Amino acid sequence: SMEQVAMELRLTELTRLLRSVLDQLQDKDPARIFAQPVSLKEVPDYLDHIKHPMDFATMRKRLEAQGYKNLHEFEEDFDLIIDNCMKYNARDTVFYRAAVRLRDQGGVVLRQARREVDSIG
């Protein structure tokens, strides 16, 4: 149906806007602390601590499959990245600190992304 195509075009254009958002957020992580999944070979206890691991590569795979239906879903995954790290790592660590800085800087980007998604529909 044409209605199904039109919905698919809207998902495509959301995907485009979320790719730009993802790029901008990842630039706020110049150390690449959040680029890849935590390795269970190197942190074998991780899944005892953190139930839903997340990282930028995993988000990018979901994005390229058009797997985010709305901005809320994408924000949920970004928040997991930050929140997971702030639980596993202590306040005095480079990891925790990196997460705080990513959260603070990413807020700016997400605030305007929300206006854009609402505005364009």
UniProtKB/Swiss-Prot annotation:
Its localization reads: Nucleus; Chromosome
User: Where is it made, tissue-wise?
Assistant: Highly expressed in testis.
UniProt domain Bromo: residue ranges: 9-113
Q: Where is this cross-link: Glycyl lysine isopeptide (Lys-Gly) (interchain with G-Cter in SUMO2)?
A: K41
Its subunit composition reads: Component of some HBO1 complex composed of KAT7/HBO1, MEAF6, ING4 and BRD1/BRPF2. Component of the MOZ/MORF complex composed at least of ING5, KAT6A, KAT6B, MEAF6 and one of BRPF1, BRD1/BRPF2 and BRPF3. Interacts (via PHD-type zinc finger domain) with unmodified histone H3. Interacts (via PWWP domain) with dimethylated and trimethylated 'Lys-79' on histone H3.
Q: What does this protein do?
A: Scaffold subunit of various histone acetyltransferase (HAT) complexes, such as the MOZ/MORF and HBO1 complexes, that acts as a regulator of hematopoiesis. Plays a key role in HBO1 complex by directing KAT7/HBO1 specificity towards histone H3 'Lys-14' acetylation (H3K14ac), thereby promoting erythroid differentiation.
Which protein are we looking at? Bromodomain-containing protein 1
Species assigned in the record? Homo sapiens (Human)
